[PDB]
Design a protein around this ligand. Structure first.
Ligand SMILES: Nc1ncnc2c1ncn2[C@@H]1O[C@H](COP(=O)(O)OP(=O)(O)O)[C@@H](O)[C@H]1O
Ligand SMILES: Nc1ncnc2c1ncn2[C@@H]1O[C@H](COP(=O)(O)OP(=O)(O)O)[C@@H](O)[C@H]1O
Ligand SMILES: Nc1ncnc2c1ncn2[C@@H]1O[C@H](COP(=O)(O)OP(=O)(O)O)[C@@H](O)[C@H]1O
Lengths: 735, 496
């Protein structure tokens, strides 16, 4: 029973010590707003924390932080006892004793500079036997007392004094190093860590569950992603925060020894893990271990692969161990390792997007401090092609510029140095600007896979097609019973056409943002490259990665690019069938219907498109996007002008009604050209931050009309051909 | 295990994982120890990585093993009783030297289980536990098509973990010791299987699916004239061989039927496979265009090789004119009507054994651009023309397509069928799908009646499409008279 336990859950707030509760929880423990919560761990220890009351952020979950995880030896999937302590205690005497384990490189008095201007207006409670970290000196040191006033009676108050003895105590191995990598050190990966969280804690946190049940436990997990995404970091964290022996083998040192003992080393590596149960085995790289694709040289390289296959094939129950492997791309792993019982679980981690990169800036900067005008939100927005390790490299090399630009005008060069200056290292905005403009990204030409910020308000007008996309995307994933009962299979994909520059890409991105689903962008040149080069297998990986990145939505921009490059309507003697779209068809037909992977096709010349892709089953839903009317052009202009500063006397209705045959891009280029004039005038006047009517009057003289009446009637003749309201279109049936 | 013989298993990686010099001795002693423990049996888990004498060709260390295996199975005289069993993944990875007589003469192929096969294996991996009364395995194995046998076992195991995770989260029975009186309450619900199956990753999804469909003769509305034709050419030579043999007339090798698109050419081929309790292979248009653009011409060899060994079976070549359409069609370039893929189909069709009950069905919609070389007597001589459905058969088509959907009693189908003149089979099915769209959307909107009324059909009929215009009509009458030719002496009473 005991209806007071709280299950440990993942924390989303990057705060110091705050616990979120529910409305009924205050009335059960009669606790006030700010109280002293007492927690019972094991081995007769207590912990103190600060509770926060909120009924908007969380509903019935706790937010337990890592500052008290190591102070109570409590991990994920464990129960705890909560108890209020309304007793009022004011500490007046405390004892401090540094341990001779991490005091290297630290000189002078560090308490008076790091602890005095940090605990004011904080009232943080402390207890004998707590490990807490501080942010100072471009690092983070720990503290642990061994003899002080009887617990508790410990409150940080200004009346306390300082003292020194000079006789450090020897540390013990009972506790672990809290500085090691944990679950709070990985950001920008919510969906990928969730799968690991829901497959690793079953056979490790509760080993006794699996000796009694006959359920097959997962034995091998394969990690993916470009180099530097953090495959090693995740494996190090999931083993350090679970309580299992982590054994790491890189792979080059396996193959660096003489031929004959590498196999013995690999065998003993697996053998030593079984006795140290629970245990875990992680392989840093696997492509250079089993390159049975194109290398095929020497039995020395095949003996290792055979030994690994033998070692993971014979992994019966016996003990509890999980073999984790990481690589860079699936096209470099021996398929013999992908069989069942060796590597059946494959997880892919992609490039973090703007909301993901900002989440990982903080981990690599929390050890230091910045200025008040320097914000990491904007610095991670315009970058798109940076891997996780690129951010860490950028921060490190920005710190060096900070100190270089600080000591040049000071010239504090002498015999010895003092520790009271390196705490003043503050990174400015220009430091990050120059450091980022100088950084060299690693991966920049991959299929970027991210969820855009674009919403339905970005697309002006087109209210008729918004509901159409909603009713074909959101419905089959929200009401499967209603679709299943009527006995009608959901639409596999939608292709919409129309004149260029009308929001076909924005429509596809909005339906991905609204569904909280992933998005893949395949442009025209991305599809022309695989045609000229006779590289036809490149379409296999697109669908393979889209399927595994579920949920997701495909996008095939300007599918008629091959037809345009081949001649179009007539061209040569050939018809309308090509090789790339042919390979798209056989992969589209082979997709599983249940999976929530949608395909969106975009084109502007449907007359030269392949009729074979129009058949019912692959792309049957067609949406025609006409030119915006006067009603929607005002919305398009005002949506495009939200970011730019626009004056109050700028009338948009007249401007929108003045343009008759103008598409969406024609209105955006007008705004860009108007911004050009304002920027140029502002620069010239330096030797007003607003856009007036004069800027638009001059910009409208350079207006372009890409869609002429030549492009107009090419679509009415197509719409009537596809609709065909003749014969019996509008007739009242007697029955 | 169920015969009473000593089972000896060798994987193959541990054979090649030891130092060079003792692996051959281990393999030899493995064969030698089986003879003394008679009766015995030898099974090799994988053989492609044991004898990769196709493209690897590196080192005598890898050829010594192959030679040792060949020596050990070549010298298997009577002496004792032992059977060497080997498994692999695909025939294109085995040394042909092992396929000789006396080493591996018996080849058996096991395909992907279909809906009736997968349901049969759900029960084995779930009998150890119990489910709820509303959870049924019949429907869960129906919509899946690309799952291997081990995929089902993996899916069940990972659904069980979700069951316990969703059960102990709200209970939190975490203490020092555990009791055995709770794990018997582990019941798997429907949403558990739904999320587990939607999250599973199938292994094989782009193979030639080889299965027997559920489709029957009642699914195809009308076309009573062509049903008997297919019966009399498929079921007869396999049922009365003596009657065919006595008259001295060889059975028809294959049948190609043509007609406008969307008229049941695929369903006709599938029904004749279901009725004969025979296997079925489906080769679509893109499946045939892929082997043409890529200059991969040997891919047609394996199709016929696996069709022959999967006897009884029926072939299907959908839209055979796809290569001609992609090449230009009637005129195109200066070339004629002969290509490479259909050329390789001809040499494989001529080489088939007549006795084997492997039928070939060809489907096309533009017979004017088809290769005349495939029309010759001997390969595809029987031609069936499938015209547009009449008023009599459109009612049957609509009522057959509407069996699954809930249809109200006041929905008249005869008027709807007689209202459409130039509508093919797919034109009637898209109307029903569009009518179901409106009912589903109205049902969802009204949430904030489970039936289809006349209003749903009235609105859906406004969006009706007529794919087959009169442009596509007379292109077939001119062909039918050319092939039939009742002129000169068509209808004349002979005195003798
Ligand atoms: N998502 C991430 N969050 C935080 N740090 C990351 C992330 N991805 C990469 N890093 C940084 O990259 C460094 C090394 O990359 P790592 O992942 O260890 O190698 P690999 O990418 O090959 O697994 C880590 O020490 C970590 O600081
Ligand atoms: N309806 C619209 N609402 C807002 N912006 C639009 C609209 N149509 C076009 N644009 C602008 O034109 C640009 C090009 O639109 P795009 O999505 O590329 O359409 P398409 O791909 O069909 O040409 C967009 O980046 C957007 O700024
Ligand atoms: N005679 C018919 N009876 C039932 N359904 C039909 C019929 N003709 C066409 N259909 C429907 O039209 C769709 C297309 O039929 P299909 O098998 O492709 O024939 P074809 O290949 O000649 O177009 C089928 O999925 C089927 O539901």
């Amino acid at each position: 029973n005991r209806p007071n336990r709280l299950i440990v859950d993942e924390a989303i707030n990057e705060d110091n010590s705050v616990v979120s509760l529910s409305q009924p929880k205050m009335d059960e423990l009669q606790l006030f707003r700010g109280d002293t919560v007492l927690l019972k761990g094991k081995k007769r220890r207590e912990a103190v924390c600060i509770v926060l009351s909120d009924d908007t952020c969380s509903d019935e979950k706790i937010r337990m932080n890592r500052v008290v995880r190591n102070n109570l030896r409590v991990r994920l999937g464990d129960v705890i006892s909560i108890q209020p302590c309304p007793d009022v205690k004011y500490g007046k005497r405390i004892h401090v004793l540094p341990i001779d384990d991490t005091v290297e490189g630290i000189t002078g008095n560090l308490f008076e500079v790091y602890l005095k201007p940090y605990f004011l207006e904080a009232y943080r409670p402390i207890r004998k036997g707590d490990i807490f970290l501080v942010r100072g000196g471009m690092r983070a040191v720990e503290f642990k007392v061994v003899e002080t006033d009887p617990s508790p009676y410990c409150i940080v108050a200004p009346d306390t004094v300082i003292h020194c003895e000079g006789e450090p105590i020897k540390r013990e191995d009972e506790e672990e190093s809290l500085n090691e990598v944990g679950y709070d050190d990985i950001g920008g990966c919510r969906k990928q860590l969730a799968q690991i969280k829901e497959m690793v804690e079953l056979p490790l946190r509760h080993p006794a569950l699996f000796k009694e049940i006959g359920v097959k436990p997962p034995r091998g997990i394969l990690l993916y992603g470009p180099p530097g995404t953090g495959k090693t970091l995740i494996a190090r964290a999931v083993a350090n925060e679970t309580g299992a022996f982590f054994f790491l083998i890189n792979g080059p040192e396996i193959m660096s020894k003489l031929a004959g003992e590498s196999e013995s080393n690999l065998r003993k590596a697996f053998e030593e893990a079984e006795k140290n149960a629970p245990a875990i085995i992680f392989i840093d790289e696997l492509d250079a271990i089993a390159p049975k694709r194109e290398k095929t040289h020497g039995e020395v390289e095949r003996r290792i692969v055979s030994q690994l296959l033998t070692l993971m094939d014979g992994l019966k129950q016996r003990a509890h161990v999980i073999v984790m492997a990481a690589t860079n791309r699936p096209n470099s792993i021996d398929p013999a390792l992908r069989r069942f019982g060796r590597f059946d679980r494959e997880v892919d981690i992609g490039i973090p997007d703007a909301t993901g990169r900002l989440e990982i800036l903080q981990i690599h900067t929390k050890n230091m401090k910045l200025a008040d005008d320097v914000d990491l939100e904007q610095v991670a927005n315009e970058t798109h092609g940076h891997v996780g390790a690129d951010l860490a490299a950028l921060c490190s090399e920005a710190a060096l510029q900070a100190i270089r630009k600080k000591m040049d005008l000071i010239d504090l060069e002498d015999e010895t140095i003092d520790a009271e200056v390196m705490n003043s290292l503050a990174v400015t905005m220009d430091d990050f600007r120059w450091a980022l403009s100088q950084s060299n990204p690693s991966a920049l030409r991959e299929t970027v896979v991210e969820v855009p910020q674009v919403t339905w308000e970005d697309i002006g007008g087109l209210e008729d097609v918004k509901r159409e996309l909603q009713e074909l995307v959101q419905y089959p994933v929200e009401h499967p019973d209603k679709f299943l009962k009527f006995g009608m299979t959901p639409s596999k994909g939608v292709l919409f056409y129309g004149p260029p520059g009308c929001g076909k890409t924005l429509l596809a991105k909005a339906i991905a943002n609204e569904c909280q689903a992933n998005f893949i962008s395949i442009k025209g040149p991305e599809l022309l490259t695989m045609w000229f080069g006779e590289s036809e297998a490149n379409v296999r990986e697109i669908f393979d990665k889209a399927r595994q990145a579920a949920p997701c939505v495909l996008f095939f921009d300007e599918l008629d690019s091959i037809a345009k490059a081949r001649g179009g309507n007539i061209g040569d003697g050939g018809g309308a069938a090509d090789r790339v779209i042919n390979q798209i068809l056989t992969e589209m037909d082979g997709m599983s219907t249940k999976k929530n992977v949608f395909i969106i096709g975009a084109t502007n010349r449907p007359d030269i498109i392949d009729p074979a892709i129009l058949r019912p089953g692959r792309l049957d839903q067609l949406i025609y996007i006409p030119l915006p009317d006067e009603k929607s052009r005002v919305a398009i202009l005002k949506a495009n002008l939200r970011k730019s500063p626009v004056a109050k006397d700028v009338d948009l209705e007249f401007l929108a009604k003045m343009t008759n045959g103008f598409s969406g891009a024609d209105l955006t280029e007008i705004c860009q050209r108007a911004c050009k004039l304002a920027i140029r005038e502002s620069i010239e006047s330096e030797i007003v931050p607003e856009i007036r009517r004069d800027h638009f009057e001059e910009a409208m003289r350079f207006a372009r009309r890409s869609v002429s009446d030549n492009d107009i009637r090419k679509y009415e003749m197509f719409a009537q051909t596809l609709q065909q309201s003749r014969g019996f279109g509008s007739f009242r049936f007697p029955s």
